[PDB]
Amino acid sequence: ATIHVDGKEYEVNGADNLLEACLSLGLDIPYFCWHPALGSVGACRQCAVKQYQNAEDTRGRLVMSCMTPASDGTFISIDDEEAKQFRESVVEWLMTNHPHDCPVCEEGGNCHLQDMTVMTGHSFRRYRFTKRTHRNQDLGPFISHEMNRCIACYRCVRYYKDYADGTDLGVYGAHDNVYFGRPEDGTLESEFSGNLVEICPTGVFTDKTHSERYNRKWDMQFAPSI
Amino acid sequence: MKNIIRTPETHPLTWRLRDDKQPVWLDEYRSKNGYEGARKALTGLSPDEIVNQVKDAGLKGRGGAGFSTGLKWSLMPKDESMNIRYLLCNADEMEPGTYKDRLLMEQLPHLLVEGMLISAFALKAYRGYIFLRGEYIEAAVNLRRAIAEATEAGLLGKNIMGTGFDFELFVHTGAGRYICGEETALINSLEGRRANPRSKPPFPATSGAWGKPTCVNNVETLCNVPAILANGVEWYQNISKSKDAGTKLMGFSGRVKNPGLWELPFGTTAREILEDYAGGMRDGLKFKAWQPGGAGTDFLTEAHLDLPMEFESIGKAGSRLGTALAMAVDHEINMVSLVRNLEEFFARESCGWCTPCRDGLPWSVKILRALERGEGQPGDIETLEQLCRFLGPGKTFCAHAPGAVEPLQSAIKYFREEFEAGIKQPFSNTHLINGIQPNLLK
Amino acid sequence: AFELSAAEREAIEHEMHHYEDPRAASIEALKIVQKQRGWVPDGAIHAIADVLGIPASDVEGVATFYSQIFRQPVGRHVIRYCDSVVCHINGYQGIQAALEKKLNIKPGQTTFDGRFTLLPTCCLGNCDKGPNMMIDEDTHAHLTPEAIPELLERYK
Amino acid sequence: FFRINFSRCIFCGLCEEACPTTAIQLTPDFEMGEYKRQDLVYEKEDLLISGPGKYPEYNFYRMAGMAIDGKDKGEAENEAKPIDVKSLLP
Ligand SMILES: NC(=O)C1=CN([C@@H]2O[C@H](COP(=O)(O)OP(=O)(O)OC[C@H]3O[C@@H](n4cnc5c(N)ncnc54)[C@H](O)[C@@H]3O)[C@@H](O)[C@H]2O)C=CC1
Ligand SMILES: Cc1cc2nc3c(=O)[nH]c(=O)nc-3n(C[C@H](O)[C@H](O)[C@H](O)COP(=O)(O)O)c2cc1C
Ligand code: SF4
Ligand code: SF4
Ligand code: SF4
Ligand code: SF4
Ligand code: FES
Ligand code: FES
Numbered sequence: 001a002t003i004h005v006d007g008k009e010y011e012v013n014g015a016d017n018l019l020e021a022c023l024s025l026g027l028d029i030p031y032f033c034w035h036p037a038l039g040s041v042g043a044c045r046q047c048a049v050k051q052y053q054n055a056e057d058t059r060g061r062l063v064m065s066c067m068t069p070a071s072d073g074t075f076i077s078i079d080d081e082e083a084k085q086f087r088e089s090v091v092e093w094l095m096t097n098h099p100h101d102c103p104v105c106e107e108g109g110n111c112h113l114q115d116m117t118v119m120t121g122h123s124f125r126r127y128r129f130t131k132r133t134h135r136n137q138d139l140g141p142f143i144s145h146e147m148n149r150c151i152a153c154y155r156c157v158r159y160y161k162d163y164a165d166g167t168d169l170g171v172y173g174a175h176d177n178v179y180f181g182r183p184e185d186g187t188l189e190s191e192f193s194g195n196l197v198e199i200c201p202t203g204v205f206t207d208k209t210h211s212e213r214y215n216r217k218w219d220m221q222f223a224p225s226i
Numbered sequence: 227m228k229n230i231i232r233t234p235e236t237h238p239l240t241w242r243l244r245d246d247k248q249p250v251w252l253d254e255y256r257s258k259n260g261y262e263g264a265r266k267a268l269t270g271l272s273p274d275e276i277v278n279q280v281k282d283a284g285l286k287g288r289g290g291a292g293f294s295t296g297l298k299w300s301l302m303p304k305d306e307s308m309n310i311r312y313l314l315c316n317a318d319e320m321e322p323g324t325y326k327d328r329l330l331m332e333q334l335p336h337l338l339v340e341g342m343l344i345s346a347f348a349l350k351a352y353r354g355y356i357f358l359r360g361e362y363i364e365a366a367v368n369l370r371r372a373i374a375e376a377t378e379a380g381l382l383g384k385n386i387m388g389t390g391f392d393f394e395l396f397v398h399t400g401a402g403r404y405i406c407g408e409e410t411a412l413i414n415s416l417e418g419r420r421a422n423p424r425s426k427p428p429f430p431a432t433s434g435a436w437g438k439p440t441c442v443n444n445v446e447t448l449c450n451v452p453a454i455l456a457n458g459v460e461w462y463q464n465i466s467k468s469k470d471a472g473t474k475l476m477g478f479s480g481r482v483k484n485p486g487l488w489e490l491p492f493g494t495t496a497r498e499i500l501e502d503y504a505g506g507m508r509d510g511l512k513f514k515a516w517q518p519g520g521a522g523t524d525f526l527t528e529a530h531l532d533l534p535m536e537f538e539s540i541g542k543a544g545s546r547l548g549t550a551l552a553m554a555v556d557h558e559i560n561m562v563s564l565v566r567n568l569e570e571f572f573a574r575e576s577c578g579w580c581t582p583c584r585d586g587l588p589w590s591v592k593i594l595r596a597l598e599r600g601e602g603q604p605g606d607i608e609t610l611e612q613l614c615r616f617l618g619p620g621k622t623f624c625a626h627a628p629g630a631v632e633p634l635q636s637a638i639k640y641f642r643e644e645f646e647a648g649i650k651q652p653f654s655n656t657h658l659i660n661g662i663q664p665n666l667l668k
Numbered sequence: 669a670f671e672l673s674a675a676e677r678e679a680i681e682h683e684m685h686h687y688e689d690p691r692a693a694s695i696e697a698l699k700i701v702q703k704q705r706g707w708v709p710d711g712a713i714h715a716i717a718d719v720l721g722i723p724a725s726d727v728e729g730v731a732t733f734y735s736q737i738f739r740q741p742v743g744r745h746v747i748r749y750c751d752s753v754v755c756h757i758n759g760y761q762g763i764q765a766a767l768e769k770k771l772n773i774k775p776g777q778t779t780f781d782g783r784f785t786l787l788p789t790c791c792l793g794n795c796d797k798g799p800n801m802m803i804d805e806d807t808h809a810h811l812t813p814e815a816i817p818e819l820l821e822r823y824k
Numbered sequence: 825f826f827r828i829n830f831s832r833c834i835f836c837g838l839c840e841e842a843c844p845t846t847a848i849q850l851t852p853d854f855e856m857g858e859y860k861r862q863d864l865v866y867e868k869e870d871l872l873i874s875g876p877g878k879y880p881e882y883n884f885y886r887m888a889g890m891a892i893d894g895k896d897k898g899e900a901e902n903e904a905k906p907i908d909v910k911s912l913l914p
Contacts, residue, residue, distance in 0.1 A: 042623055043579055045582055045621065046581070048621070063620070085616075086616055093582060096585055096589060097585065103844045105890070126655065127589065128655035130592075130902055130904040132907070133898045133904060134906050136897075148889040148890070167724075168725055170726060171578075171729055173578070173732045173909035174577070174732070174733055176576065176585060177909060182725070184710075322753045322754060323752075325794055327793070328793045363805050400734075400736075401698070401699060401735070402735045403735060417691060418691040418720075419694075419726075419730065420733040480795070480798075521752065553753065556757070564757070567751075571790060574914050575790065575914075659881075660879060776913040790914065
């Protein structure tokens with residue numbers, strides 16, 4: 001398939017969506033709810049690009065790149081001003097309720113929400129009202145829970161339930177009080193619950209074992225091991 | 227206007243209503259030409275012929291969007307290996323300002339049952355569900371009684387009228403969310419899930435309830451069906467000289483002399499509805515605004531009152547026809563308080579799925595509360611306008627948020643002076659930190 | 669602590685017969701438990717999950733999604749006054765003030781004797797007869813603030 | 825622990841600028857001469873003074889959503905109280 005991103009011609013797989021095709025080409029599109037292993041649902045509304053009907057089109061339309069097939073002869077723009085403004089607005093809406101927690105958050109320096117906040121260029125708060133808050137649950141010895149930092153990207157439930165077939169994690173509540181956790185306190189029973197700490201783009205689910213002796217990702221000495 | 231004559235030729239939906247506001251049961255319904263269209267459909271017409279008949283009649287969606295019903299029915303798959311088809315009646319009707327389906331189901335339940343029967347035969351739908359809101363208690367009682375009477379009379383169940391067609395009709399009462407009326411979220415709630423909507427394509431006609439072909443239609447569309455099949459296509463096309471065929475339940479509500487509901491042809495102007503049928507505004511009240519089609523439509527002014535109640539004319543004026551149940555706003559109503567109430571409803575009826583609705587409708591609510599208390603700050607109106615622009619069609623997962631920002635758009639467009647009167651404080655979201663000199667932005 | 673009564677179990681299974689998938693009876697199972705006991709307690713989530721064969725997380729998500737499934741104890745009668753825009757024009761605020769001054773509770777609260785719980789609901793689909801109220805199953809229209817102290821005293 | 829190698833430090837102030845709680849502060853004192861270079865490694869007992877320094881009132885924990893003793897959820901600045909998901913209100 002042939003796509004044109006910002007007037008530049010690329011050859012992609014027509015069976016892919018535009019978000020994964022553009023990330024594979026090295027382009028940067030911010031995203032939260034999409035994951036390579038979980039598929040596309042179009043929840044967070046972060047990955048908006050501007051699609052044009054043809055090359056001789058100037059108005060365009062904001063589409064979700066994760067929900068749009070990268071079909072032959074596609075014309076999109078990532079660096080469109082209206083698309084950039086919308087993506088910054090989505091980060092702003094997630095930032096309205098987000099707690100002032102980065103120094104005391106185990107995800108700092110390793111946080112996808114931080115990265116997409118910076119990538120959209122949002123650094124000025126004009127929201128002046130209150131932030132919603134949440135009580136935390138006890139999820140057992142491995143996973144620490146901080147529901148304040150949630151952006152309701154639904155990655156956790158989609159992984160834990162539709163991928164790993166776990167039964168004891170879900171989404172509760174409604175409009176802007178949507179809660180992600182267990183129905184009550186207790187150990188998460190999935191044998192693969194630990195992948196939440198990398199699936200969750202924020203610091204809601206964090207490695208409690210690491211949190212005991214915490215250090216930031218830049219301070220870590222890594223090696224490839226088995 | 228008290229002198230309303232409801233002939234069956236001009237009033238297909240309401241001519242058999244009773245004066246004592248009592249429901250019409252099976253004996254009285256069949257006495258007044260009941261299940262004749264169902265008999266003609268099931269005994270003398272193919273399902274494809276009924277689909278094409280509804281398509282040629284021009285029956286558009288009475289739920290608000292006005293999509294063609296024959297086009298929606300024709301989009302079911304032609305594969306004969308799929309025969310687990312479902313017909314769903316969207317009896318939710320949760321939009322503020324909408325009360326037409328309540329009247330239709332409470333007083334004429336067999337009209338809905340017959341329309342579901344004809345539509346289920348046309349769609350080859352083996353099962354049918356009436357997704358009814360949980361607050362319509364009397365509608366639930368009347369619909370269940372009408373279904374029991376039609377089952378005992380052989381109009382429902384197995385081998386209906388000797389044709390071999392099997393149709394089972396259930397009534398599923400809801401548990402109170404406004405998003406449950408959105409058709410894909412309706413399907414999700416029918417399956418016992420949280421009522422999040424679904425991305426289309428695939429449309430429910432190909433993959434709907436439990437992955438089967440499913441057709442969701444409003445109560446009023448299915449109630450339009452039996453008159454179409456009992457009187458013909460030409461009759462349905464020869465009662466209004468407008469591009470929207472047939473009759474529509476229209477009505478004015480809110481501080482008018484006679485708030486109510488009347489069956490009127492398309493192309494009837496809003497002014498004649500408001501004056502002749504609603505009686506005009508009440509004593510000592512001045513008409514200042516109106517919403518044509520419920521809480522999710524744009525406000526219109528007095529100059530727009532001469533518009534015919536059609537999809538195209540109201541759409542060309544910067545609004546939409548919606549449910550065609552207009553709400554009148556008098557001069558004693560402050561627009562900032564009204565829009566604050568509207569946005570409070572829309573923000574707490576968010577389903578929580580997608581970010582802009584879930585997290586920007588509460589921001590509009592808080593800005594409107596500040597403007598209502600007189601604590602507005604500069605940049606609030608611009609923030610509201612940006613929220614209106616960025617919650618439009620396509621930016622959010624479903625259509626709840628564009629409908630939410632339509633009244634805010636129109637109220638800022640027309641009655642901007644109230645919104646600017648809300649702004650009384652200087653802008654601030656920072657307090658002073660003692661040892662740090664602030665960056666004084668220009 | 670919680671055990672489903674026999675009639676509740678038969679009603680839930682009869683509702684399960686109506687659907688291709690047993691998960692589709694979750695809302696009606698919650699409403700059956702709520703009709704029998706006023707609200708859905710904590711053990712009812714696991715009991716309904718066991719009957720339906722779906723996870724308790726799914727049942728809790730459904731119960732907390734829908735506004736009319738009560739996951740906290742309510743009073744003997746639930747007053748549900750309309751909050752939406754036509755009743756705002758018709759003056760629901762006077763009705764809410766009258767209800768608050770009679771019951772001495774805020775919306776979302778229950779009286780100290782457990783008789784009434786006051787709740788704002790969305791539009792009751794009765795906008796031409798507003799303002800509107802719903803006590804437990806009865807819809808009261810054409811409300812005036814002076815008719816509240818007579819309407820409330822016929823719900824013992 | 826908190827240690828600073830003052831034999832290495834160039835007194836540039838980048839740490840104080842980087843501190844999001846105003847905990848670390850460079851102060852008007854310059855008499856830090858030493859006999860042994862090992863004594864220029866200052867542990868936490870050599871750095872933690874008994875007052876607020878140059879920023880007299882900032883409390884980062886009054887801003888953070890994360891709960892500690894004396895501040896539960898909803899008690900930080902500009903924070904609403906936590907609405908329980910089982911609340912009766914719509
Ligand atoms: N209580 C009520 O009656 C309420 C009504 N509404 C109405 O909802 C409307 C918007 O709702 P939507 O569901 O977004 O309407 P829509 O315009 O997306 O489509 C309406 C119907 O047409 C079908 N459809 C549309 N395009 C199709 C296509 N290309 N192929 C196949 N089927 C297609 C949909 O499946 C649906 O059944 C508004 O106009 C508003 O008036 C909104 C809120 C409450
Ligand atoms: C948020 C939202 C709520 C809706 N609520 C209803 C409703 O309560 N009743 C209804 O008939 N349609 C409702 N609709 C419109 C439906 O999606 C759908 O268009 C309609 O129910 C069936 O189409 P029809 O008009 O052809 O019958 C709603 C749409 C949205 C976006
Ligand atoms: S989740 Fe990310 S953005 Fe939120 S407090 Fe933690 S590090 Fe900061
Ligand atoms: S808890 Fe994490 S993974 Fe789940 S919705 Fe919130 S941010 Fe996404
Ligand atoms: S716009 Fe988004 S969050 Fe709002 S009701 Fe629709 S899908 Fe749910
Ligand atoms: S950052 Fe601080 S500790 Fe490091 S050299 Fe600069 S002043 Fe010294
Ligand atoms: S990544 Fe596409 S909408 Fe979330
Ligand atoms: S607005 Fe109150 S009944 Fe509709």
